[PDB]
Ligand binder design. Structure first.
Ligand SMILES: CCCCCCCCCC(=O)SCCNC(=O)CCNC(=O)[C@H](O)C(C)(C)COP(=O)(O)OP(=O)(O)OC[C@H]1O[C@@H](n2cnc3c(N)ncnc32)[C@H](O)[C@@H]1OP(=O)(O)O
Ligand code: NA
Length: 319
């Protein structure tokens, strides 16, 4: 196998060329790839909060060097790419794209396999930084979420947003209680925390929001003193002023976002993104969508009335 035959066998488009070129140049990792198998796999994937229908598919499809030569070449070199700049927030590492699914379930779950392969390196990095065992495990559960969201959106197996799993398994995302933080750098090169609200964890009550937000600064000072971020950033449908037209006075979103300062910048279209995060939308007719919560009602009514949603970018300066 080489880059050209791997492209051909895995049905990859021409736009995969530069990533494959990078992988070919890296070659196999200095530490051989070991994927868990059988019940070791079941146990780990449960701990990672992967849902049951997927667990069995992922376990059954586990690739090997002789059974899946092209995918194995790819997994090996993709994994290598992640350990090579492990924990280094000054280098951009795009993982691969989502692979073509016609090649089978191993391709469909490729990023799960890259994730599992890279866990020992990730954990070695966490230990050198003295990351507590609990925060490593809570952070790693993003893998369950990625898988769950894919099946929820498409009704079939996969990983949602593999660039996020890639960043997390490179030691650059930490979940602290309800919230996730990534060690980023802004346009001007100054350190910043990217703040993300994952889906798993329930409603954003103020107590769980502030308990996380207060822990961020000293956590990253204790474990990543080199980084030095003082602000946090995020861009979201959640920061659209129009939500105040619809949501009730005691809304956690309306209350908690008052702590954020909105950046003024060119309009950012938010119909796709709100439909994504409110419905995990997949092109169905609007009248077919669930209409239980006041937000579900609001999103649909607003859109049906010929009006639009926006994303906004915001910042905090941290407590
Ligand atoms: C808020 C301050 C922080 C703002 C900074 C954000 C910038 C950071 C960048 C990001 O993190 S972008 C990714 C954001 N993540 C997501 O959107 C994940 C999916 N969203 C959710 O899980 C919820 O929207 C969330 C937990 C974040 C908030 O839910 P809450 O229920 O705590 O919100 P709230 O109290 O304001 O909701 C009021 C009404 O809207 C409903 N609602 C809110 N989110 C909903 C949702 N996602 N789907 C269906 N309904 C939702 C909620 O049920 C309720 O209706 P009812 O009283 O009729 O029940
Ligand atoms: Na490199």
């Amino acid at each position: 196998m080489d880059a050209e035959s791997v492209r051909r066998q895995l049905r990859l488009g021409e736009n995969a060329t530069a990533w494959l070129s990078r992988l070919e140049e890296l070659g196999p990792p200095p530490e051989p790839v070991r994927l868990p198998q059988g019940d070791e796999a079941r146990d780990l994937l449960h701990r990672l909060e992967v849902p049951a229908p997927d667990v069995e598919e992922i376990v059954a499809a586990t690739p090997g060097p002789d059974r899946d030569p092209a995918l194995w070449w790819l997994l090996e070199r993709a994994h290598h790419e992640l350990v090579r700049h492990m924990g280094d927030y000054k280098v951009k590492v795009r993982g691969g794209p989502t692979l073509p699914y016609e090649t089978g379930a191993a391709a469909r779950y490729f990023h799960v396999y890259v994730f599992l392969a890279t866990l020992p390196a990730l954990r070695r990095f966490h230990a050198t930084r003295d990351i507590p065992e609990a925060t490593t495990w809570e952070t790693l559960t993003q893998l369950g979420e990625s898988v769950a969201i894919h099946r929820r959106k498409y009704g079939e197996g996969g990983t949602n947003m593999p660039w996020w799993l890639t960043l997390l398994v490179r030691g650059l995302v930490y979940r602290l209680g309800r919230l996730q933080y990534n060690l980023a750098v802004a346009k001007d090169g100054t350190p910043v925390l990217g703040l993300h609200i994952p889906e798993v964890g329930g409603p954003l009550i103020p107590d769980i929001y502030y308990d996380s937000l207060r822990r961020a600064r000293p956590f990253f000072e204790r474990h990543f003193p080199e980084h030095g971020a003082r602000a946090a950033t995020g861009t979201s449908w959640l920061l659209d002023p129009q939500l105040a037209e619809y949501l009730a006075e005691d809304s956690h979103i309306l209350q908690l976002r008052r702590g954020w300062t909105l950046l003024d910048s060119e309009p950012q279209d938010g119909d796709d993104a709100i439909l994504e995060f409110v419905f995990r939308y997949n092109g169905q007719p609007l009248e077919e969508l669930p209409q239980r919560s006041t937000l579900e009602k609001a999103v649909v009514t607003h859109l049906l009335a010929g009006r639009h949603w926006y994303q906004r970018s915001g910042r905090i300066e941290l407590p």
